[PDB]
XYZ file of C-alpha atoms in Angstrom:
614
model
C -19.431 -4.425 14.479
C -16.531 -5.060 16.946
C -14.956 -7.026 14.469
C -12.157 -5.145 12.321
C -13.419 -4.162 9.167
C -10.911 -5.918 6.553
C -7.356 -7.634 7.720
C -6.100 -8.211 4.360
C -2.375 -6.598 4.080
C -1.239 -6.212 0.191
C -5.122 -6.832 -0.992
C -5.373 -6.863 -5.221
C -1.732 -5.072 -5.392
C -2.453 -6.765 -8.714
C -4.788 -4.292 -11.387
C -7.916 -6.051 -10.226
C -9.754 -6.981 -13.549
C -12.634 -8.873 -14.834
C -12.803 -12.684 -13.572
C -14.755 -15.422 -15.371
C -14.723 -19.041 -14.156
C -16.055 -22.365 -14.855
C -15.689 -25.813 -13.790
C -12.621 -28.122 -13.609
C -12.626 -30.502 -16.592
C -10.381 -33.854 -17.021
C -6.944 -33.791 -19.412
C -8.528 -35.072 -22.508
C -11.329 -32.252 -23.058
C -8.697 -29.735 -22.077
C -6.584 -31.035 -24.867
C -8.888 -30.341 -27.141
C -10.358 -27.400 -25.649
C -6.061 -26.116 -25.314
C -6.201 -24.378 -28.621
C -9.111 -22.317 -26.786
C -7.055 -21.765 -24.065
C -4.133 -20.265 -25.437
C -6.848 -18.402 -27.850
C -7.716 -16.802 -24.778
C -3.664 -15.999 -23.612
C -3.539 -14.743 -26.821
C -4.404 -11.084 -25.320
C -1.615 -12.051 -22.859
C 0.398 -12.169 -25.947
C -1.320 -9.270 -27.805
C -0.978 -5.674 -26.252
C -2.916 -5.168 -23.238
C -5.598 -2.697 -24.522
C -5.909 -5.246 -27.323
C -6.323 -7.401 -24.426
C -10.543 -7.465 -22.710
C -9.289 -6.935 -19.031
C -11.127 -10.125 -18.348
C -9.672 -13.003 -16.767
C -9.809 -16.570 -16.368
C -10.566 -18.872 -12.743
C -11.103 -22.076 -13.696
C -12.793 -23.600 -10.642
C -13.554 -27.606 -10.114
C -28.909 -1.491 15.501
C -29.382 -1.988 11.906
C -29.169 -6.014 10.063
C -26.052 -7.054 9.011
C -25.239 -7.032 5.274
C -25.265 -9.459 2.765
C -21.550 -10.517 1.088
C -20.781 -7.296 2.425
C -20.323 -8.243 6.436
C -16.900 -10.029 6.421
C -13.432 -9.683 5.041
C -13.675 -13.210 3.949
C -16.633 -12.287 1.871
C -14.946 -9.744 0.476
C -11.832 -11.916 -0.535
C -14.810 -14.083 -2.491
C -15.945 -11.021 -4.064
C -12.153 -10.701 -5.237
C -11.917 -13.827 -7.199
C -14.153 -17.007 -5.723
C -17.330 -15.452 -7.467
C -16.705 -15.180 -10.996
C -19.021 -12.243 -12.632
C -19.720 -14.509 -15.681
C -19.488 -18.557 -15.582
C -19.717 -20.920 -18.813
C -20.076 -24.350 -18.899
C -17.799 -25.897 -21.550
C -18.711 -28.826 -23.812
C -19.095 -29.587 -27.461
C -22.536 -28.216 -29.486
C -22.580 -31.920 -31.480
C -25.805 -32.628 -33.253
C -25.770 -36.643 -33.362
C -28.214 -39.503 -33.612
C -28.538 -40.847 -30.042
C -25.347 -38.873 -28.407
C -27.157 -35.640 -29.139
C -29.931 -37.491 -26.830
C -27.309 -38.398 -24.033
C -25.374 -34.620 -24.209
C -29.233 -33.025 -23.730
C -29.728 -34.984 -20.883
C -26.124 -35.151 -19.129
C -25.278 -30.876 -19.796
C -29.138 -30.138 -18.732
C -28.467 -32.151 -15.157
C -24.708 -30.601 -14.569
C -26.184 -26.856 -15.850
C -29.582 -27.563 -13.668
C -26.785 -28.087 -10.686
C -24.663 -25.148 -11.458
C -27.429 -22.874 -11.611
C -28.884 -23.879 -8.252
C -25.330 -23.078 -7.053
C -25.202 -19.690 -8.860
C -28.817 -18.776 -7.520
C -27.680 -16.784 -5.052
C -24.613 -15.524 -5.411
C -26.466 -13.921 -9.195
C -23.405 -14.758 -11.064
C -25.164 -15.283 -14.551
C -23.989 -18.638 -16.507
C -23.884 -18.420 -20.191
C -23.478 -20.909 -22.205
C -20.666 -21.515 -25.215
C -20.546 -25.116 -26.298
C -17.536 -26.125 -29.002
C -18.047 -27.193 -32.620
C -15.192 -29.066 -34.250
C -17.666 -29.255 -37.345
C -18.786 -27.303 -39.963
C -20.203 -24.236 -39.468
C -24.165 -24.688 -39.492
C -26.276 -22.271 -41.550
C -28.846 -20.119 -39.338
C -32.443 -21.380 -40.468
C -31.697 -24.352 -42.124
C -31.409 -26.587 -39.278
C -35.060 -27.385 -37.302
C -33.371 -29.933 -35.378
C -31.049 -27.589 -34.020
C -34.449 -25.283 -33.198
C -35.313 -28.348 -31.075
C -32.266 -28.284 -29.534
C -32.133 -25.064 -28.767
C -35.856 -25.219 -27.320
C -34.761 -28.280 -25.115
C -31.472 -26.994 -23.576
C -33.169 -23.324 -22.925
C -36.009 -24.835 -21.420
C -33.786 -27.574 -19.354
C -32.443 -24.614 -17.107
C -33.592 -21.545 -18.102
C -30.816 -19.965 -20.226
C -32.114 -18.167 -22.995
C -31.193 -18.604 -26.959
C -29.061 -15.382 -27.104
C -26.792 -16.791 -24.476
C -26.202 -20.031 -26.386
C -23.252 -19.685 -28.274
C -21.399 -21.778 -30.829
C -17.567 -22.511 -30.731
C -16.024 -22.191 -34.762
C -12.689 -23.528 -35.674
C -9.797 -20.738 -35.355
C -10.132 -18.617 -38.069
C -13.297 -18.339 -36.598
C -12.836 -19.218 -33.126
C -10.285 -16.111 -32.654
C -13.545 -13.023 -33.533
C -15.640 -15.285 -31.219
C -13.649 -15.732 -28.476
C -13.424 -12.247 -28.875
C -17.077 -11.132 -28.932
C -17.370 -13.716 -26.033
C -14.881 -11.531 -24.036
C -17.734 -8.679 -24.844
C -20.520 -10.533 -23.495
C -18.585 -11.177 -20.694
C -17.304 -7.818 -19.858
C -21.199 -6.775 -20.809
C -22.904 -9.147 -18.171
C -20.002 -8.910 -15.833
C -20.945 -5.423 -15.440
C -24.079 -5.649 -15.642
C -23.894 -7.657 -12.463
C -21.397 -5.720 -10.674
C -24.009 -2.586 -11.297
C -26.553 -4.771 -9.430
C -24.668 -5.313 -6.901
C -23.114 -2.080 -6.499
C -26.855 -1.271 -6.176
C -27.453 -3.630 -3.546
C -24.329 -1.884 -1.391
C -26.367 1.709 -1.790
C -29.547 0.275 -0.461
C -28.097 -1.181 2.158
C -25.784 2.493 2.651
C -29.024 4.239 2.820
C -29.875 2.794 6.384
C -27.320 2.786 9.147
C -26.306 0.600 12.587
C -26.674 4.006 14.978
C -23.594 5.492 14.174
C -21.323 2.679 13.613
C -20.130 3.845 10.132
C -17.500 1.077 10.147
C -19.895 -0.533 7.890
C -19.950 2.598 5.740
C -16.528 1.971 5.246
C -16.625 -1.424 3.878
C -19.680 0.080 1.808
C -17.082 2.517 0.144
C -14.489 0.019 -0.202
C -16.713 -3.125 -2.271
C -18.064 0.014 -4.054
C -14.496 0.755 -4.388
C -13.683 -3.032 -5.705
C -16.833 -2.050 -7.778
C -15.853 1.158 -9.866
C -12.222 -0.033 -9.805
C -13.256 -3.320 -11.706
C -15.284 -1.161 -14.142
C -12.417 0.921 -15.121
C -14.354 3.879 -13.716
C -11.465 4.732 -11.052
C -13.288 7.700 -10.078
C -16.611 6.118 -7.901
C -14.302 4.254 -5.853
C -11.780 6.891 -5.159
C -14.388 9.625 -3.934
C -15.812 6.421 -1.460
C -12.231 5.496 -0.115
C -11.713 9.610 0.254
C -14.784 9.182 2.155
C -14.607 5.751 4.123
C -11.505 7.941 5.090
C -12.361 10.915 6.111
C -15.007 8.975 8.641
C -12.242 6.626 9.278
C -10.837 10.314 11.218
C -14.395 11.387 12.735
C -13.796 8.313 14.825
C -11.463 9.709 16.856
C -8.757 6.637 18.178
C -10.777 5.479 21.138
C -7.977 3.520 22.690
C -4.377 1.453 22.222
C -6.473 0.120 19.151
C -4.827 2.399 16.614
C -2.990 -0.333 14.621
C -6.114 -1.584 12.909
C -6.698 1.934 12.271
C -3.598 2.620 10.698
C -3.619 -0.757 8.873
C -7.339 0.668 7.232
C -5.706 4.113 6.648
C -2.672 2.196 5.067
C -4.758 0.284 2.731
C -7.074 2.931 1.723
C -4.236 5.279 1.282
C -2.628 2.632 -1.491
C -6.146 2.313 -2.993
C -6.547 6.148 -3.253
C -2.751 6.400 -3.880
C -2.705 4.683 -7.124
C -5.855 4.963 -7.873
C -4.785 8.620 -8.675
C -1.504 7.593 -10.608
C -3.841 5.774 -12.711
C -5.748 9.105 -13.342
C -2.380 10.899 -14.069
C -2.683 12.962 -10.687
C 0.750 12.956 -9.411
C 0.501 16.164 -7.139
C -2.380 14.924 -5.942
C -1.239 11.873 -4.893
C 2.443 13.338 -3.116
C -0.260 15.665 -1.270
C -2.317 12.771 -0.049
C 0.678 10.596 1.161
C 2.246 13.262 2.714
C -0.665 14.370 4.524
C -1.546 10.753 5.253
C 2.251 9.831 6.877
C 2.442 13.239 9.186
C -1.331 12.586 10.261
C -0.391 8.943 11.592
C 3.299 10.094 12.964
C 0.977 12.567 15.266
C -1.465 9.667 15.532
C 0.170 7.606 18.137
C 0.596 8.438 21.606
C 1.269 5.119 23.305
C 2.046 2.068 22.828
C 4.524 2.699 20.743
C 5.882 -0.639 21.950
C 8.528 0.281 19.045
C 6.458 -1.931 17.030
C 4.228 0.383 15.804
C 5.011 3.513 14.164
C 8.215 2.292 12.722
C 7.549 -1.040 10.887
C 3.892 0.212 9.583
C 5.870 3.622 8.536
C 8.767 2.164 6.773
C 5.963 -0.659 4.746
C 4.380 2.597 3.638
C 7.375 4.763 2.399
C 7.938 1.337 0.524
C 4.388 1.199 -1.280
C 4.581 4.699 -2.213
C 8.142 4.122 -4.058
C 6.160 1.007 -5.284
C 3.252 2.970 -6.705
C 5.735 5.457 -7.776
C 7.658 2.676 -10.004
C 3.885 1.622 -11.104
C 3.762 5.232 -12.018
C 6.702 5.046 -14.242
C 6.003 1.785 -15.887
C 2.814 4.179 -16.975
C 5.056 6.685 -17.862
C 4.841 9.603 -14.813
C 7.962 11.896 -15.046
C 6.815 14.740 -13.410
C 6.958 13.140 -9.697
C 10.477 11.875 -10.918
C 11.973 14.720 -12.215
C 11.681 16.374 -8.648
C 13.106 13.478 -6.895
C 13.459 9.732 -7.981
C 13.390 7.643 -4.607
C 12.240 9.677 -2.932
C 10.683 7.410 -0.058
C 12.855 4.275 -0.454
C 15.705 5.346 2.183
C 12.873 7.326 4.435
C 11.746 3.963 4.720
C 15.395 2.788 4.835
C 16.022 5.143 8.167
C 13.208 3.905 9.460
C 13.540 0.105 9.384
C 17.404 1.615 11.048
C 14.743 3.107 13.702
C 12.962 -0.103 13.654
C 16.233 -2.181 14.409
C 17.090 0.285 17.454
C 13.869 0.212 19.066
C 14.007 -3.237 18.896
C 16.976 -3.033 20.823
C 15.577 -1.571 23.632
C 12.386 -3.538 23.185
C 14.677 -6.382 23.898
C 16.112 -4.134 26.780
C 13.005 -3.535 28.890
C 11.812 -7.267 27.814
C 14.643 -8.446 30.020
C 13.226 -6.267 32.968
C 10.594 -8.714 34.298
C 9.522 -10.200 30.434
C -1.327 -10.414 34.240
C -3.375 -9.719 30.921
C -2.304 -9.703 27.410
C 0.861 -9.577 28.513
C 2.124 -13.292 26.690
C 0.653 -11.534 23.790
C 3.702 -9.015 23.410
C 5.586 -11.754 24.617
C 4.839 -13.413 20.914
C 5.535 -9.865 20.102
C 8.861 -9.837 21.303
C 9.615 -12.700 19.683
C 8.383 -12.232 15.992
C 10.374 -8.985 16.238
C 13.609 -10.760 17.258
C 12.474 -12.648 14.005
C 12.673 -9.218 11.932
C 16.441 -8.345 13.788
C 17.478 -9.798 10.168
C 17.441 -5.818 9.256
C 19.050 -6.580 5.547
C 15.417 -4.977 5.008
C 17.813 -2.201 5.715
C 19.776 -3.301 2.735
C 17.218 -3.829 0.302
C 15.445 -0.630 0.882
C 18.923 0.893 0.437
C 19.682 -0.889 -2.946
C 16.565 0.608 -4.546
C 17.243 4.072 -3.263
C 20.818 3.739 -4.403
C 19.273 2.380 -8.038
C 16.484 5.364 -7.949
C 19.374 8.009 -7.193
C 21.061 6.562 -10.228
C 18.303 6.967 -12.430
C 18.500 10.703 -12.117
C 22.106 11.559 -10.896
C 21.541 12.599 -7.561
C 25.134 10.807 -7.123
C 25.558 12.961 -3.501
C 22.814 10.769 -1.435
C 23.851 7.286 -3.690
C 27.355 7.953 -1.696
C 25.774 8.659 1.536
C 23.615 5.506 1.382
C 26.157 3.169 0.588
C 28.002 4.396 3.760
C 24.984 3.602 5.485
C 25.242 0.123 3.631
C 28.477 -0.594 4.593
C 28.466 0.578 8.401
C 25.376 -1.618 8.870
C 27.484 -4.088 7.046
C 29.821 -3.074 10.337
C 26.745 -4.085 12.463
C 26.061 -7.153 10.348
C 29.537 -7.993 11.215
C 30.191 -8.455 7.550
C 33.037 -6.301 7.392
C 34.376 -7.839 4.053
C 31.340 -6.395 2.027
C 31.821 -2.885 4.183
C 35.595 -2.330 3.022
C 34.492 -3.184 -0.298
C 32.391 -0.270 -0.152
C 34.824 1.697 1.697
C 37.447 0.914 -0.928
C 35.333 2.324 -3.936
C 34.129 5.490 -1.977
C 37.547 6.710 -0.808
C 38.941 7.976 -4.303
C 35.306 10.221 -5.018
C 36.167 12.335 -1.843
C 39.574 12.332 -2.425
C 38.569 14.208 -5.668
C 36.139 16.437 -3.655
C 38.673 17.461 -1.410
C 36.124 17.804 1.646
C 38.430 17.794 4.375
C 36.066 17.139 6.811
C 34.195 14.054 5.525
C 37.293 12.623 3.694
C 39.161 11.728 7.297
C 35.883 10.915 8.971
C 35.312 8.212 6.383
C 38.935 7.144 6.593
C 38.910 6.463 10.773
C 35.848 4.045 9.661
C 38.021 2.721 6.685
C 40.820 1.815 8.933
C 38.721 0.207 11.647
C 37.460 -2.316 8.616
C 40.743 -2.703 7.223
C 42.246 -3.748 11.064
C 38.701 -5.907 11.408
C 39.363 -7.587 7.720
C 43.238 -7.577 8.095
C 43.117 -6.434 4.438
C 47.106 -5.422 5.447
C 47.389 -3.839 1.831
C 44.274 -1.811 2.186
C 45.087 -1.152 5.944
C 48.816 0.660 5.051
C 47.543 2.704 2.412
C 44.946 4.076 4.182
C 47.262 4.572 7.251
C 49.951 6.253 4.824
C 46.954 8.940 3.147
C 46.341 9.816 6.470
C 50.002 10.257 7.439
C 49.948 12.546 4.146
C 47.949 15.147 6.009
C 47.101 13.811 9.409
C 47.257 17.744 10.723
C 43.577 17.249 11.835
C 43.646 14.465 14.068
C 45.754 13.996 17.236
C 49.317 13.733 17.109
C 50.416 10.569 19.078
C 47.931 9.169 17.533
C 49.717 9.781 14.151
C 52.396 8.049 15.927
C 50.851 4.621 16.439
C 49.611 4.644 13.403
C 53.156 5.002 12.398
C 54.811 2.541 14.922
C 52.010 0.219 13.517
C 52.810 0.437 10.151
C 55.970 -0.057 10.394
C 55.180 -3.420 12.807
C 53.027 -4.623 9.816
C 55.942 -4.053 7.094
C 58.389 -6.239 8.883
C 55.219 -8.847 10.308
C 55.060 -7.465 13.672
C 51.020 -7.206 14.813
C 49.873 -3.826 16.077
C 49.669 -3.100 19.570
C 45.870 -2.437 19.480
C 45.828 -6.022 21.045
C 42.792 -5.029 23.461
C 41.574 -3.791 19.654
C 41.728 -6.878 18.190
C 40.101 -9.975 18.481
C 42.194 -13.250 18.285
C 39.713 -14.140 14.938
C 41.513 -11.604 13.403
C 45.126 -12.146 14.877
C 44.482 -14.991 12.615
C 42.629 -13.048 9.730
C 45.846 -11.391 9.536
C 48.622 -13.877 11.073
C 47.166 -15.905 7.745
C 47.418 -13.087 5.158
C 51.129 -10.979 4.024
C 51.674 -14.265 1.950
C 51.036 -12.152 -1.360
C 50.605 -8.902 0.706
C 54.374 -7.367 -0.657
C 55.829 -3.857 -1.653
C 54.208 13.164 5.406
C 53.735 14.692 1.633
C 57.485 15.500 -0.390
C 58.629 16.260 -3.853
C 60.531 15.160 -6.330
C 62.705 17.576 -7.096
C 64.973 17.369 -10.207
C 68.087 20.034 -11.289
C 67.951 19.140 -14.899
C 65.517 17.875 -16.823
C 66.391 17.561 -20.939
C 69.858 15.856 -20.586
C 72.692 16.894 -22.804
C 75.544 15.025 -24.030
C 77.152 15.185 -20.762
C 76.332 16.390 -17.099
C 75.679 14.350 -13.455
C 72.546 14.757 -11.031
C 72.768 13.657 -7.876
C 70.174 14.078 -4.599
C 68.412 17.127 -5.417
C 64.761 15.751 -4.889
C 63.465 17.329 -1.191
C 61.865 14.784 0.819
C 59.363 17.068 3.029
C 57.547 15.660 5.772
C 54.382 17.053 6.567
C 54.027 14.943 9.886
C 55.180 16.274 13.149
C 56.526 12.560 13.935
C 59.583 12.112 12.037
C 59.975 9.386 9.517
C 62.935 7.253 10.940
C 65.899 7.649 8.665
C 67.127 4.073 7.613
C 67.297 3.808 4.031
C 65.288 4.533 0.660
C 65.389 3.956 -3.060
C 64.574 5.558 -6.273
C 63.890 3.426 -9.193
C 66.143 4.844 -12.373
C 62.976 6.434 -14.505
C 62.713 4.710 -18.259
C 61.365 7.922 -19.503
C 63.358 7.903 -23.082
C 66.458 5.549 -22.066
C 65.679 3.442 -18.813
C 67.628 5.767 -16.441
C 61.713 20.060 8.728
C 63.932 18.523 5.333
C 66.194 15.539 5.408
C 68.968 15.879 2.522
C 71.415 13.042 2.212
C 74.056 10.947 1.294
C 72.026 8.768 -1.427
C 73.346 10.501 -4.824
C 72.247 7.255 -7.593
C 73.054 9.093 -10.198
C 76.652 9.248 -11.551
C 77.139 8.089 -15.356
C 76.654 9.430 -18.947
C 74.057 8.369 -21.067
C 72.068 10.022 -24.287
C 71.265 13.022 -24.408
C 67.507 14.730 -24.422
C 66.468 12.533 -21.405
C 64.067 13.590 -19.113
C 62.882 11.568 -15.865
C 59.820 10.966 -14.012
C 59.536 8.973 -10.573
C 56.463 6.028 -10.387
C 56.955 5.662 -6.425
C 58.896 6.797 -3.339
C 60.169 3.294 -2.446
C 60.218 4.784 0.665
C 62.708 2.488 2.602
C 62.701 5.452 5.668
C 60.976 3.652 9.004
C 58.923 1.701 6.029
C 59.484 -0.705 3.051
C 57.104 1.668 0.913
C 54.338 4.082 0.738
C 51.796 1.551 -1.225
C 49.999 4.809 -2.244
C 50.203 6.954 -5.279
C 51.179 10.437 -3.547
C 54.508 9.824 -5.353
C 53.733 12.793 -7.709
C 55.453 11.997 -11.802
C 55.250 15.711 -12.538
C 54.138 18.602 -10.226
């Protein structure tokens, strides 16, 4: 009435299917009754169609409805009421144990039917033979028995059953399954039934118990594989959920019922091979509840339920193509996964300032989002961030939409940045450098690289640090040119051990990040330009290469090297005095540089711009 309707997040994500129960028995008849038992996971092990969708429990102002009035009710509808329940012991004809089984399984079945009274659940009875199979009509004895046990509680002869060894045992488990699945149904028609007469009267306009009407008819058709009964009550339960217009703050619960239905409808379409149908409904759904909300909005709401349902969708959208749905897939793979990825982000920031006005002051309610507070401080984890990222990254994958797998692993690594785990972040950085250096887009490639650098000063990766510095240098044109300079002046610091001034920069963690490292750390664009390539039997070359600098700040002119190529035998412009090459050798010798070895200001460039052949 006032009550919510259901609070169950994440209710029967599982295929809900056919549940049969009976009662807890000791080790010793469940050893002998295990052959029965993995008869029965034998459809586990056998395809799934081949599997009966049954399952297995294995227990020890209008009136109010009946099993129908509370969520916890309904979670015993789910699985504490088995539709069908057997009570298991051996069918033994004997002398004066035949006597003492009568009497002992007519007392515990008289008990289990005065518990199954009321909640109808109809108890059929299978009892084991380990002996030979009796012929039909030759037994009277076994007549007598049959009279006494049908007449000790009720149960009629066609529900007896007989347990036969396996060869047997495997077709009658099987038909078993049948009866199940047959009487199952049969009771969840009654009670389905029972929900319309109770529909056809109402509380004045409540309508909230419509809802739950729709939804156990909903647990109803889905459990009878008719998928369509239940999704025309949920589009229903639904669509009344919206003529109650949101009387107050009170939306969440609302949300939390549209949430759930809009799963239940969701897949409930994938399983009917409606894909557009289903893309229509969420959409619709999403952009409905983003205009839902108009206060309060404590940052808690909008963002944490939005991102959990961009993550169901891509959920039910795997589900989708575990059945096999390409069409949704061949427009876009992940579609939702980094929607709901941005929005945890959002989630993160408004708990920022949800922190922020809690340290304003902190008469009514109010140590309620206090609690609030807190559990959100719980979620500031945010590698939900992460994880929603890895399976959009993954999803892009799947169909090479390689564009947004780059973009979200920057987003990886500069919340990385934020996690402080900078390590993990210049990994990143270090892979996606070399893919826009192919694709030559000038204006992300140095964006990315200020971002590099800062993790590479952060890290004190010193390697990684100079040749990104010295690929900027390359063409720095872009960016400010003192800047260029320190970068420079840095460098060079860094070659001969001297820490960069960015002191204020730094932190004195990673003075000693890099203090510590250079141990194994060892070893602006020109040209190589050579007079004569293809040697003959004897000539001299001297400094003909052209060391251009496309930097304004010059390179300071110290010293430099050239390493004697081993191509066929082993061996403003600043030209020089440096002329290596002054001997014969073979002839037909061409050359071909690795690396500057650019001793000028630095020890070397680090980075391959040290072109072999133009």
């Amino acid at each position: 009435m006032t009550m919510d309707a259901t609070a169950l997040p994440s209710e029967l994500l599982v295929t809900p299917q056919p549940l049969v129960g009976f009662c807890g028995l000791d080790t010793a008849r469940v050893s002998v009754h295990k052959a029965v038992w993995e008869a029965f996971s034998g459809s586990l092990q056998r395809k799934a169609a081949d599997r009966a969708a049954v399952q297995y429990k294995l227990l020890p102002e209008w009136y109010h409805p009946k099993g129908i009035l509370k969520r916890n009710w309904m979670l015993k509808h789910l699985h504490v009421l088995p539709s069908v329940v057997v009570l298991f012991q051996d069918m033994e004809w004997n002398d004066l144990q035949w006597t003492e089984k009568q009497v002992q399984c007519a007392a515990i079945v008289q008990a289990l039917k005065n518990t199954l009274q009321e909640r109808n659940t109809r108890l059929c009875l299978v009892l084991l033979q380990r002996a030979a199979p009796l012929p039909p009509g030759e037994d009277l004895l076994a007549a007598e028995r049959a009279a006494s046990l049908t007449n000790a509680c009720g149960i009629t002869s066609k529900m007896l059953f007989i347990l036969p060894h396996t060869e047997h045992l495997t077709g009658y488990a099987l038909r078993l399954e049948s009866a199940f699945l047959d009487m199952a149904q049969s009771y969840y028609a009654l009670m389905s039934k029972r929900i319309r007469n109770h529909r056809d009267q109402l509380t004045a306009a409540h309508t909230s118990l419509k809802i739950r009407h729709q939804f156990k008819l909903g647990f109803v058709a889905e459990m009878r594989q008719d998928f369509s009964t239940g999704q025309k009550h949920y589009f229903q339960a639904y669509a009344n959920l919206d003529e109650i217009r949101i009387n107050d703050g009170n939306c969440l619960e609302i949300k939390t019922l549209a949430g759930f239905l809009n799963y239940k409808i969701c897949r409930l379409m994938f399983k009917l091979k409606t894909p557009r149908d289903a893309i229509n409904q969420f959409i619709i759904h999403v952009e409905k509840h983003k205009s839902r909300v108009g206060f309060k909005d404590l940052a808690f709401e909008h963002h944490a339920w939005l991102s959990t349902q961009h993550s169901v969708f891509a959920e039910l959208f795997c589900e989708a193509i575990k059945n096999g749905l390409p069409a949704l897939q061949t427009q876009h793979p992940g579609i939702y996964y980094h929607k709901a990825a941005e929005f945890v982000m959002k989630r993160r920031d408004a708990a920022m300032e949800a922190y922020a006005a809690m340290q304003a002051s902190s008469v009514a309610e109010q140590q309620a989002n206090m609690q609030l507070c807190d559990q959100e401080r719980s979620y500031n984890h945010s590698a939900a961030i992460i994880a929603l990222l890895s399976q959009a990254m993954a999803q892009f994958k799947i169909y090479k939409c390689l564009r947004f797998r780059k973009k979200l692993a920057i987003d990886m690594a500069e919340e990385y940045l934020k996690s402080g785990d900078h390590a993990k972040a210049l990994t990143l950085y270090s892979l996606m450098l070399p893919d826009y250096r192919q694709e030559k887009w000038t204006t992300i490639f140095t964006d990315v690289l200020l971002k590099t650098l800062r993790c590479a000063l952060l890290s004190g990766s010193v390697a990684d640090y100079i040749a990104c510095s010295v690929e900027a240098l390359s063409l720095r044109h872009q960016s400010d040119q003192s800047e260029r300079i320190l970068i420079l002046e840095n460098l060079w610091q860094v070659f001969q051990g001297v820490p960069p001034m960015p002191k204020t920069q730094l932190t004195p963690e990673a003075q000693a990040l890099w203090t510590s490292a250079l141990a194994n750390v060892k070893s602006v664009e020109m040209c190589a330009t050579f007079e004569r390539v293809q040697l003959s039997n004897d000539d001299l070359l001297q400094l003909q290469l052209i060391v251009r600098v496309l930097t304004d700040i010059p390179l300071r002119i110290r010293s430099f090297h050239v390493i004697l190529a081993d191509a066929g035998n082993p061996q403003s412009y600043y030209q020089l005095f440096c002329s290596t090459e002054a001997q014969q050798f073979h002839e037909n010798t061409q050359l071909r540089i690795v690396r500057l070895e650019a001793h000028m200001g630095t020890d070397q460039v680090a980075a391959l711009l040290t072109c072999s052949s133009n």
